[PDB]
Amino acid sequence: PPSDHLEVFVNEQPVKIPKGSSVLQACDAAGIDIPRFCYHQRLSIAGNCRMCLVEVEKVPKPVASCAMPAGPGMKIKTETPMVKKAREGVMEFLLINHPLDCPICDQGGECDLQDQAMIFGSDRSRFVEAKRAVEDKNLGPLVKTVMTRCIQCTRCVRFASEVAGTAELGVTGRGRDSEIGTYVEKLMGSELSGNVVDLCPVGALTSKPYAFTARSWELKGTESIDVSDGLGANIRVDARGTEVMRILPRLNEAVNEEWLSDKGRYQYDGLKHQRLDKPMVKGPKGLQVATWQDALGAAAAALTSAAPGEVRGIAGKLADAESMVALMDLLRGLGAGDLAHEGGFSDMPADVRSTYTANTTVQGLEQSDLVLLVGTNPRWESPVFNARLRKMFLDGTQVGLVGAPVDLTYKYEHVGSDPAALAALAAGQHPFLERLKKAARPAVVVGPGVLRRADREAVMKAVHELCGKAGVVKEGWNGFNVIHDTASRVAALDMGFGPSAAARARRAQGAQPKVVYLLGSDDYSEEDVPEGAFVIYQGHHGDRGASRANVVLPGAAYTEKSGLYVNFEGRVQQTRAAVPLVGDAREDWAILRALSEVVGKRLPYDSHAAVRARLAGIAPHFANIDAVQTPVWLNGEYVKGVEALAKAAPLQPSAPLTSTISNFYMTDAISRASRTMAKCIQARQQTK
């Protein structure tokens, strides 16, 4: 390369930077953190706040370091008298029209304007004129505006145009009367609309559900993971004692960059309603509060009095791996085999991890120049993943879709809508195959709605044939990806949480269980929980599954426990407890260990480390937290192995490949109890 790293001088120190880097990036590589208001790493460069002004030799004016490219042998000075005078003057211009609002503003304590004024500004003002006053704007139930505090950095406009894709904000007026918003009364309709509150450096845009409730210095922050979908976005939970006050994203470039959907950000208020805090046993009066010994004894009596073939265990969408392996080992120790998952396709073969995970990974998908989506709506399954797909679209990656046509906030080519179109694509009838055959690194993304189908094996065989013909998987590149929408599904597939052959046969001839264990399940089908059965519900919210149960055992939510979750790319991540257990609830694996002791066959582990070691004994990649293995690819041997499942239950070429998520804002028991999600739905209903 022709010296792809160039050398600059920052305060007489030599710094090597990549080519095309700005002056601000050279200052950052020298260990200097230049003040800024309009620059962002994820947005396009604007250059309008004038706070990043530094001095370059042989230039008589201050340059804007965010926008100015760095040339070879450049000499940058960041601490001369003109730089300090520039910083103080620009701060003084920023503060003359700002309202004296720090007591009533929610950014007070974590404000860029306050801290930068304290450090790089003066201590006085000389301004005694009247200020500019601006009326506030309505942008929906999630974003609160006090527009007198706007400093015209246009981060919101650039975000709405570039990442969210909706492009609904603009600057109206001219000069001092420039004004941010929508000209007409509109609602911010993006699923990623809470991120702009983080992007605003001031209290012009604040979070409406959070408003006036806390200051940032009072909050104990815990780094956890998000379980509202299958991506597992990295988050920080802020709590005051026993109460969670807000949820924010945190940086992870391999998973979520810096974003978080509105469901994962705003569903925390469902943790304050309908909570199970006591064990209950159903008596002649109904469910009534009982001791833990009594509730464990009743559950053990019902689990032991029934035959082993009349017991079924259903895992919920939010069950961690430790509780799932505990329930699996407890039910298998009694001679049962009927295991089911609330997220569907419980009879799916889980032999090779590459067949139900994203082999390209999330960050490795950016090296693809052509993407074919099969039967998925990524905007409602994972809006952060869809934002990364839009980022790929903006720098040249072409997108095609086989499925039901949906709004994706980027242009795509609709190849078809049914498996007949998939077969026509594999044969060669559609010209998109020649586009895939000439692509350097093609990618195929299969959504969870395909795997929920009754004919999923034939569709997966067609997808495998298409990948074989189009060079999707070859030497040096694996472009085959299967994504999920539930937090607990991949861990259950990893550990082997699946029904036995005898249990599948008994379901085929129509045997009905008498005892059902509901491990956090509230979206079960009626075929799996018969009426008149004995129901043991273990969970944290009182919902459909708890209103029907005979024994209720209160567990922990994901803000109260440290459980393992695996996302759809195969990465093992963990929650952390941000608040203690509520009431008389317990840890979720501990309930099953105590219940195995009361039944009469103890589980061989007595600690959290020991049940994690049992998980690592089943599949060794469980021990490597915050990392992803490279899964083995067995070419067409796996598809040859399951041809009996392709011959039975044949293909349905007329049923469209759709997405199963029909309610984005309410997908589980926590989001169904959230009043903010209900207001979000009501806002979209009252606009018609």
Binding site: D33, G109, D112, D115, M118, I119, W217
Partner: protein
């Protein structure tokens, strides 16, 4: 025993020019050149005696603390007769986490100096009871608060904390409210120590700015 009342008139001066110049400028180099094996590091900083000057800080090993202090007490140019205090500072990031600090005052020439020794939790520091008589209670307090053992002390016992108190409260890993609390029991008819429970737990406010430059 110095600074006897000698002038019967009002004095409008502090020190002499030559000795004040020597103390405020040359004392660090003088101590380093005369006794080099005693000194391992020196800092000349913002002057314990006054806001207008500079004064030295001497770092030494525990093996030579007593000869250095005897030299600083008895040498004709450094007559540091008064030991004001002995204390410690905890630095949990270091291999030797404690810095034992000695402040001295010279009534002869209106000077002050600071002497430091770095040790960990299990290295004894020689006592200065024979050199300075106040070193007794200060070393007892330093042992009480930090757990620094002073070898050769006549009676090293705790002086400040409770009678059965194990634990050294001024360490960074010791909790502010501790582990035990105290109440009267009507059944046992005695004042009894119990594990800690708080009606309102302490609220920790994390105020620190992510733009602040001074944090070290």
């Amino acid at each position: 025993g110095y600074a006897y009342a000698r002038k019967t008139t009002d004095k409008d001066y502090i020190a002499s020019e030559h000795m004040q110049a020597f103390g405020n400028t040359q004392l660090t180099d003088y101590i380093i050149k005369t006794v080099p094996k005693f000194v391992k590091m020196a800092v000349t900083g913002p002057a314990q005696s006054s806001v207008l000057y500079q004064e030295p800080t001497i770092y030494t090993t525990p093996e030579s603390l007593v000869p250095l202090m005897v030299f600083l007490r008895d040498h004709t140019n450094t007559q540091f007769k008064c030991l004001l205090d002995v204390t410690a500072v905890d630095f949990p990031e270091r291999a030797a986490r404690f810095e034992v600090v000695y402040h001295l005052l010279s009534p002869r020439w209106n000077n002050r100096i600071r002497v430091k020794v770095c040790v960990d939790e299990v290295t004894a520091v020689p006592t200065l009871c024979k050199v300075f008589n106040t070193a007794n209670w200060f070393e007892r307090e330093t042992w009480d608060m930090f757990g620094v053992f002073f070898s050769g002390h006549p009676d090293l016992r705790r002086i400040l904390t409770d009678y059965g108190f194990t634990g050294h409260p001024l360490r960074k890993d010791f909790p502010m409210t501790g582990y035990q609390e105290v109440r009267y029991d009507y059944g046992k008819k005695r004042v009894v120590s119990e594990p800690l429970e708080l009606t309102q737990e302490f609220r920790y406010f994390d105020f620190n700015s992510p733009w602040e430059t001074l944090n070290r």
